[PDB]
Amino acid sequence: LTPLFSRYKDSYLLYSFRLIDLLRASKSTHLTKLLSSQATYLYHFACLMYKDIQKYEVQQLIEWAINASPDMDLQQFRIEFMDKTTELNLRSCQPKSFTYTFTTIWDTMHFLSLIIDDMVYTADKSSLDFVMQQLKTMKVLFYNVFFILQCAMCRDHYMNVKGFIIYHIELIEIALDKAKYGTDITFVDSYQQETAGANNMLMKNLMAYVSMTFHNHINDYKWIQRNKKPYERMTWGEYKKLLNL
Amino acid sequence: IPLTPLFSRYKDSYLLYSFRLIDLLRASKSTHLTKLLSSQATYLYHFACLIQKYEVQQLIEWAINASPDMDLQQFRIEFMDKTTELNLRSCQPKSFTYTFTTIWDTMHFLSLIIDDMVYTADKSSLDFVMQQLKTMKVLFYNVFFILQCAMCRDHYMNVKGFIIYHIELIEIALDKAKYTDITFVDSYQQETAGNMLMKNLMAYVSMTFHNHINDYKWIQRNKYERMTWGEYKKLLNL
Numbered sequence: 001l002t003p004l005f006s007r008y009k010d011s012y013l014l015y016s017f018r019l020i021d022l023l024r025a026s027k028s029t030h031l032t033k034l035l036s037s038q039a040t041y042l043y044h045f046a047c048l049m050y051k052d053i054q055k056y057e058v059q060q061l062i063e064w065a066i067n068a069s070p071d072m073d074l075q076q077f078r079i080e081f082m083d084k085t086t087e088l089n090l091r092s093c094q095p096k097s098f099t100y101t102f103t104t105i106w107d108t109m110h111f112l113s114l115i116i117d118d119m120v121y122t123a124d125k126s127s128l129d130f131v132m133q134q135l136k137t138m139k140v141l142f143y144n145v146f147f148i149l150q151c152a153m154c155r156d157h158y159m160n161v162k163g164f165i166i167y168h169i170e171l172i173e174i175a176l177d178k179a180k181y182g183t184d185i186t187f188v189d190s191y192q193q194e195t196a197g198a199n200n201m202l203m204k205n206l207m208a209y210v211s212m213t214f215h216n217h218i219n220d221y222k223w224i225q226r227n228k229k230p231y232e233r234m235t236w237g238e239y240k241k242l243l244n245l
Numbered sequence: 246i247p248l249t250p251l252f253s254r255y256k257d258s259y260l261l262y263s264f265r266l267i268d269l270l271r272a273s274k275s276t277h278l279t280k281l282l283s284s285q286a287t288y289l290y291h292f293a294c295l296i297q298k299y300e301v302q303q304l305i306e307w308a309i310n311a312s313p314d315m316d317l318q319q320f321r322i323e324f325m326d327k328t329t330e331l332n333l334r335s336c337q338p339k340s341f342t343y344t345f346t347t348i349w350d351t352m353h354f355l356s357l358i359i360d361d362m363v364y365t366a367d368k369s370s371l372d373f374v375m376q377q378l379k380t381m382k383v384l385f386y387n388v389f390f391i392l393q394c395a396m397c398r399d400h401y402m403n404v405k406g407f408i409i410y411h412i413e414l415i416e417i418a419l420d421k422a423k424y425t426d427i428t429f430v431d432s433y434q435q436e437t438a439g440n441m442l443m444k445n446l447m448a449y450v451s452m453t454f455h456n457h458i459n460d461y462k463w464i465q466r467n468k469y470e471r472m473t474w475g476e477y478k479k480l481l482n483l
C-alpha cells in the first residue's frame with residue numbers, strides 16, 4: 001500500500017472505465033461478450049464494497065454500459081458513468097485521473113500481478129480450490145489485454161509474447177495442485193531457486209518479477225523495432241523498494 | 246548439429262510434419278489459411294537442407310494445385326513421385342506414423358537449428374541470423390497440430406509466447422552484439438542471473454516447455470519420470 005500502488009489502483013479503474021465505454025461501440029457479439037466478461041473480471045479483483053452486493057452492482061454497471069448510447073462521445077459517456085457509479089454506491093469504481101497512456105495499461109498489468117501473489121501467499125488449507133479458480137480468470141485477463149489506444153505494433157507484439165506471463169500463471173497452478181495432494185509449497189526468494197527446482201518451490205512475489213521482467217523486455221525490444229541504439233532500466237531490487245514487497 | 250539417434254528421429258519427424266502440412270493445402274477453406282500453410286511449409290523446408298529454394302517452390306506450387314478429392318494415401322504417392330522428379334528425395338520421410346512425438350520432435354528440431362545458427366554466427370552474418378530468428382518466431386506462432394486435439398491447440402495458443410519470448414531474447418543479444426559481444430554461458434541460471442546468452446538456450450527452453458505441458462495435463466484430467474537437462478544434453482551430444 002505504497003505511492004506506486006496508489007497509482008496502480010487508479011490506473012486499474014481508468015483502464016476498466018475505458019474498457020466498458022467500448023461496449024456501446026462494439027461491432028460484433030463476440031467482442032461484446034469479450035469486453036463485458038473482461039470488465040466483470042477486472043472489477044471482481046478491484047475491491048469496491050461486500051462481495052455479494054459488489055458483484056451484483058457491477059453487473060448493473062456493466063448492463064448499463066452495454067445499453068448506453070452509441071452516439072455519445074467519450075466525455076458524455078464519462079458524465080453518465082460518474083452518475084451511474086454514484087447511484088450504484090460504486091464511487092470506488094471512479095478513477096481520480098482520466099489521462100490514458102501506456103502507463104495506464106502497464107499499471108493494470110502490474111496490479112494484476114500483485115493480486116495473484118497475495119492470493120497465493122495467503123492461500124491456506126481450504127481456499128486452495130478457490131485460488132485455483134482465480135488463477136483461471138487471471139489467465140483469461142492476460143490473454144485478452146485491450147490496448148484501447150492505437151498501437152498496431154504493440155498489439156502484434158503482445159499477442160506474440162503474452163504466453164510468457166500465462167506460462168508462469170500455470171506454474172502457480174501446478175504448485176497449488178501439488179499442495180492439494182500433499183507436497184506443500186516452499187516459497188523462495190529468487191527466480192533462480194524456483195528455476196533450479198525444475199519438489200514444490202515457488203518464488204515469493206513471482207508475478208511481480210515476471211511482469212517486471214516482461215515490461216523490461218518490451219522496452220529493450222522496441223529499439224529493434226525502430227532501428228536505434230539504446231538508458232535506465234527498472235531493477236528488481238528497486239522495484240521491491242517502490243512497492244515495499 | 247551433432248548426429249545422434251534421437252536427432253535422426255527429429256529429422257525424419259520434421260519431414261513427416263512438413264509432408265502433412267502441404268497435404269492440407271489442397272483442402273484449404275480460405276485464402277488466408279492457404280497463404281499461411283504455404284508460407285510455413287516454405288519456411289520449414291528452408292530450414293531442412295535438401296536450387297533447393299526454387300524446387301521447393303515447385304513442390305509447394307504442386308501441392309496448392311493437387312486434387313482436393315484425393316485422400317491422404319493418394320496424395321502421399323503423388324508427393325513421392327513429385328519429390329523424386331524434382332531431385333528432392335531428401336524431403337521424403339522414412340516413416341509416416343504421425344503422433345504427438347512428430348510435433349514435439351519438429352519443435353525441438355527447430356530449437357536445435359536456432360542454437361546452432363546463433364553459436365556459429367559471425368559479425369558479418371549477424372543481420373542474416375536476425376532474419377532467420379524472425380522467421381522462427383512465425384514458425385512457432387503458427388504451429389498446426391494436424392491431428393485432432395482441440396485442448397492441445399487452446400493450450401499452446403495460451404503459452405506459446407514463452408518460447409517466442411526467448412527467441413526475442415536472442416535477437417536482443419544479437420542486436421547488442423551489432424553495436425557489446427555476447428558471452429555464451431552454460432546454464433539458464435547464469436543467463437537469467439543478469440550480454441549473456443545460454444549456450445543451447447532453445448533446446449533447454451523447448452525441453453522445459455515440453456515438461457511443463459506434461460506436468461499441466463494432470464490438472465486438465467484431475468489426476469513419475471520426466472526429462473532432465475543433463476539427460477537431454479547426453480541423448481543429443483550437446
Ligand SMILES: Cc1cc2nc3c(=O)[nH]c(=O)nc-3n(C[C@H](O)[C@H](O)[C@H](O)COP(=O)(O)OP(=O)(O)OC[C@H]3O[C@@H](n4cnc5c(N)ncnc54)[C@H](O)[C@@H]3O)c2cc1C
Pocket residue numbers: 102103105106110145153154155157158211212213214215216218219222225233234
Ligand atoms: C503489453 C504492452 C506491450 C507493448 N508493446 C510495445 C511494442 O511492441 N513497441 C513499442 O514501441 N512500445 C510497446 N509498448 C509501450 C512501451 O512499452 C512503453 O510504455 C512506451 O514505449 C513508453 O515508454 P516509457 O519509458 O515512457 O514508459 P514505460 O517505461 O513503459 O512506463 C512508464 C512507467 O512505468 C514504470 N516502469 C518502467 N519500467 C518498468 C518495469 N520493468 N517494470 C515495472 N514498471 C516499470 C515506471 O514507473 C514509469 O513510471 C507496450 C506496452 C504494453 C503495456
Ligand SMILES: Cc1cc2nc3c(=O)[nH]c(=O)nc-3n(C[C@H](O)[C@H](O)[C@H](O)COP(=O)(O)OP(=O)(O)OC[C@H]3O[C@@H](n4cnc5c(N)ncnc54)[C@H](O)[C@@H]3O)c2cc1C
Pocket residue numbers: 345346348349353396397398400401451452453454455456458459462465472
Ligand atoms: C505443442 C504441444 C502441446 C500439447 N498440449 C497438450 C495439452 O494441453 N493436454 C494434453 O493432454 N496433451 C498435450 N500435448 C500432448 C502431450 O504433450 C504428449 O505428447 C501426449 O500426452 C503423449 O504423451 P507421451 O508421454 O506418450 O509423449 P511425450 O512425453 O510428450 O514425449 C514423447 C517423446 O518425446 C521425448 N521427450 C519426452 N519428454 C521430453 C521433454 N521434456 N523434452 C524433450 N523431449 C522429451 C521423449 O524422447 C519421448 O520419446 C501437447 C503436445 C504438443 C507438441
